[PDB]
Design a protein around this ligand. Structure first.
Ligand SMILES: *[C@@H]1[C@@H](O)[C@H](CO)[C@@H](O[C@H]2O[C@H](CO)[C@@H](O)[C@H](O)[C@H]2O)[C@H](O)[C@H]1O
Ligand SMILES: *[C@@H]1O[C@H](CO)[C@@H](O)[C@H](O)[C@H]1NC(C)=O
Ligand SMILES: [Ca+2]
Length: 476
């Protein structure tokens, strides 16, 4: 599926090892500190697609599928998929080629997309750089395919970031020499054939900043689908230029101020407001970026705060911001693990309840986004507009005039006071009825064009015209 096809999607990102077992157990042990395979499978995912689609997601992002190093290293198993050795075999832990094709097919029967995580930068190996038997790598079965062994120490030296190895002396990540035509050609043939064999709709490309930029256009073109890159840097002047060589990047620029704004009742709404406007103006296309606050590479949101109002606001932001929302499996069950491995919790141990506070919130926010998109072909290309901020509030507007979603978010938290915010700049006409689609109350635009937004409980407010909800299942 094309970048234009992907703008309307909403992604549930999961670890294949951690989301769902074939046996469907909600009690099978998964000690994150052990760093071992817990037994999640592609078939497990298929069996729980009602759970995912019930939140209004249109797509899943699964961790990498290639065969990995076999060892239980000092840092555990390759359960995450980022330590590949044989790119023409699948990780048998997750099932067979038929199981991966059945997951793609199951998603397509429900009108959903499959996005697969891929790594071009490196292989994995149990042991120090000097101990590497390059013959285990398929097809790159020679040192001649790799950059000489060295570690990245000077992160300001982009040449060293690209040419030296990730990992350490315990688990090394041998660095492919992506400047070699033979390596480019092998990767380009591989990615096009992966996409073809498994009917993959889009890719999340790992580790993008660690491969020189000239590699990426050929890789994105060979894939033949929308590619979103992991460029792990919060500076939009570093990260957004990657969108000149790849369709999208993960929105790490928004990540840091989004987390800071909502993780505390003292968070900066100014930094978030400012970064929305910087990305809007200075990134090649904010509507092809992926918005997130939680992943397997940072502490979960609820590790910073267990306040559920704060968690609802940040989830609403992720859904309603420019670009593709991305929610990480467990976020909807308020998982609070810290850094790796604590943030790789098994989703099945929640019992997959569809009545949890954040399952309901995410379902409500996805519902109005999916509905608005279905009625407004301009929604996904209207650049999100922050219209208001104060110490505890940010309001933003997105969508075609007359059909815009106006979202008011708060960091007051669950013991927030009750008050009326008089909101200017929403663009609705006087006397217009609006539905607040999270709590299903109505607000009327005043004679002056200001919206009297009832604030309470630190709750997020998501406004849409009542007249435009005719025939929808929203708020009845
Ligand atoms: C992107 C990817 O570049 C990362 C490096 O492989 C990956 O981290 C994985 O490998 C490291 C280093 O061996 C482990 O400590 C992590 O547990 C594992 O996930 C990122 O997760 C991936 O997003
Ligand atoms: C896809 O299947 C084709 C035809 O059997 C094979 O040549 C190719 O290596 C496979 N690609 C992947 C990535 O498995
Ligand atoms: Ca590299």
């Amino acid at each position: 599926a094309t970048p234009a096809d992907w703008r309307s999607q909403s992604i549930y990102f999961l670890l294949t090892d951690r989301f769902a077992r074939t046996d469907g157990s909600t009690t099978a042990t998964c000690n994150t500190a052990d760093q071992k395979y817990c037994g999640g499978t592609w078939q497990g995912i298929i069996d729980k697609l009602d759970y995912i689609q019930g939140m209004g997601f249109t797509a899943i992002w699964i961790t990498p599928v290639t065969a990995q190093l076999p060892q239980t290293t000092a840092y555990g198993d390759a359960y995450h998929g980022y330590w590949q050795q044989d790119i023409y075999s699948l990780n048998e832990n997750y099932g067979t080629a038929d199981d991966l094709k059945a997951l793609s097919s199951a998603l397509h029967e429900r009108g959903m997309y499959l996005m697969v995580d891929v790594v071009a930068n490196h292989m994995g190996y149990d042991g120090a750089g000097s101990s590497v038997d390059y013959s285990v790598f398929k097809p790159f079965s020679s040192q001649d395919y790799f950059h000489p062994f060295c570690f990245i120490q000077n992160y300001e030296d982009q040449t060293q970031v690209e040419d030296c190895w990730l990992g350490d002396n315990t688990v090394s990540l041998p660095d492919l020499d992506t400047t070699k035509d033979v390596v480019k050609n092998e990767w380009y043939d591989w990615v096009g054939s992966l996409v073809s064999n498994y009917s993959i709709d889009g890719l999340r490309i790992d580790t993008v900043k660690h491969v020189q930029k000239d590699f990426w256009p050929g890789y994105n073109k060979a894939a033949g689908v929308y590619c979103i890159g992991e460029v792990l840097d919060g500076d939009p002047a570093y990260t957004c230029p990657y969108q000149n060589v790849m369709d999208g990047v993960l929105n790490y620029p928004i990540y840091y101020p989004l987390l800071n704004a909502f993780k505390s009742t003292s968070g900066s709404m100014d930094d978030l407001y400012n970064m929305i406007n910087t990305v809007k103006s200075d990134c090649p296309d904010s509507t092809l970026l992926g918005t997130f606050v939680e992943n397997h590479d940072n502490p979960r949101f609820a590790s910073y705060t267990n306040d559920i109002a704060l968690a609802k606001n940040v989830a609403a932001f992720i859904i309603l911001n420019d670009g593709i929302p991305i929610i990480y499996a467990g976020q909807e069950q308020h998982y609070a693990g810290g850094n790796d491995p604590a943030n790789r919790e098994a989703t099945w141990l929640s019992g997959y309840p569809t009545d949890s506070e954040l399952y309901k919130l995410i379902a409500s926010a996805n519902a109005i986004r999916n509905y608005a998109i279905s009625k407004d072909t301009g929604f996904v290309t209207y650049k999100n507009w922050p219209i208001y901020k104060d110490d505890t509030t940010i309001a933003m507007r997105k969508g075609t005039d007359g059909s815009q979603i106006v979202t008011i978010l708060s960091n007051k938290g669950a013991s927030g006071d009750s008050y009326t915010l008089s909101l200017s700049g929403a663009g609705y006409t006087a006397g217009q009825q609006l539905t607040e689609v999270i709590g299903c109350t109505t607000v009327t635009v005043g004679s002056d064009g200001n919206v009297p937004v009832p604030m309470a409980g630190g709750l997020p407010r998501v406004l849409y015209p009542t007249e435009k909800l005719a025939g929808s299942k929203i708020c009845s």
